[PDB]
From Swiss-Prot:
Organism: Homo sapiens (Human)
First and last residues shown, out of full length: 108 to 298 of 298
Taxonomic placement: Eukaryota, Metazoa, Chordata, Craniata, Vertebrata
Source taxon at top rank: Eukaryota
Induction: By IFNG/IFN-gamma in melanoma cells.
Stated consequence of mutating K143A: Disruption of the cooperative binding of C-terminal peptides from FZD7 and phosphatidylinositol-4,5-bisphosphate
Summary of the tissues where the protein is detected: Expressed in lung cancers, including adenocarcinoma, squamous cell carcinoma and small-cell carcinoma (at protein level). Widely expressed. Expressed in fetal kidney, liver, lung and brain. In adult highest expression in heart and placenta.
GO biological process, one term: negative regulation of receptor internalization
Keywords, ordered alphabetically: Acetylation, Cell junction, Cell membrane, Cytoplasm, Cytoskeleton, Endoplasmic reticulum, Lipid-binding, Membrane, Nucleus, Phosphoprotein, Repeat, Secreted
Molecular function per GO: cytoskeletal anchor activity; frizzled binding; identical protein binding; interleukin-5 receptor binding; phosphatidylinositol-4,5-bisphosphate binding; protein heterodimerization activity; protein sequestering activity; syndecan binding
GO CC list: adherens junction; azurophil granule lumen; blood microparticle; cytoplasm; cytoskeleton; cytosol; endoplasmic reticulum membrane; extracellular exosome
Membrane topology reported for the UniProt record: Peripheral membrane protein
Binding-site list for a 1,2-diacyl-sn-glycero-3-phospho-(1D-myo-inositol-4,5-bisphosphate): N108, K143, D144
Domain PDZ positions: 7-86, 91-166
Gene name as annotated: SDCBP
Function, in words: Multifunctional adapter protein involved in diverse array of functions including trafficking of transmembrane proteins, neuro and immunomodulation, exosome biogenesis, and tumorigenesis. Positively regulates TGFB1-mediated SMAD2/3 activation and TGFB1-induced epithelial-to-mesenchymal transition (EMT) and cell migration in various cell types. May increase TGFB1 signaling by enhancing cell-surface expression of TGFR1 by preventing the interaction between TGFR1 and CAV1 and subsequent CAV1-dependent internalization and degradation of TGFR1.
Full protein name: Syntenin-1
Length: 191
């Protein structure tokens, strides 16, 4: 979570797509979906990022529809965005024990208990938080079985990016749970 603002320069693909869905939250505009293999993935936009500006227009107070309209009508060559890095999210570093455990229970990607005397406990992992990413890989929409597989196959240092559930449930409202699994970029970034 790069406590800071940054400029991205996007370029619409063959089909005039950038691969992004935006959502209005508390009079800001936030990244609800990044489509795999899109312009938005390659320049490195992440779920929960805030869009402060689009081509130097301020996004404050915009509807989701207006944000989408503005993107749909840009001189597609070059869209500049101003991004605040995942402002609703925090990152927690934990170490698996001898038995490969970090020490919580989750359900539908949401943490529901902290196991006594674990790395999760010692690092103050919270319940009622949705898992957004593991070691920088977006996991939103994946089955619980697959978030488990990612944790098991991770090395012994585990980084998880979490969000309060209330804020999570507000951002994903009005997107069917099939589209989250289907189309949310779950890939390791390319260099």
């Amino acid at each position: 979570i790069k406590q800071g603002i940054r400029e991205v320069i996007l370029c619409k693909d063959q089909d005039g797509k950038i691969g992004l869905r935006l959502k209005s939250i508390d009079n800001g505009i936030f990244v609800q979906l990044v489509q795999a293999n899109s312009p938005a993935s390659l320049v490195g936009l992440r779920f929960g990022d805030q869009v402060l500006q689009i081509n130097g227009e301020n996004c404050a107070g915009w509807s989701s529809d207006k944000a989408h309209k503005v993107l749909k009508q840009a001189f597609g060559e070059k869209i500049t965005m101003t991004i605040r890095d995942r402002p609703f999210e925090r990152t927690i570093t934990m170490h698996k024990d001898s038995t490969g455990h970090v020490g919580f229970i989750f359900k539908n990607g949401k943490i529901t208990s902290i196991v006594k005397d674990s790395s999760a406990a010692r690092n103050g992992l919270l319940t009622e938080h949705n898992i957004c990413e593991i070691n920088g890989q977006n996991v939103i929409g994946l089955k619980d079985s697959q978030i488990a597989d990612i944790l098991s196959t991770s090395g012994t240092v585990v980084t998880i990016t979490i969000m309060p559930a209330f804020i999570f449930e507000h951002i994903i409202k009005r997107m069917a749970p099939s589209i989250m699994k289907s189309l949310m970029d779950h890939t390791i970034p390319e260099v």
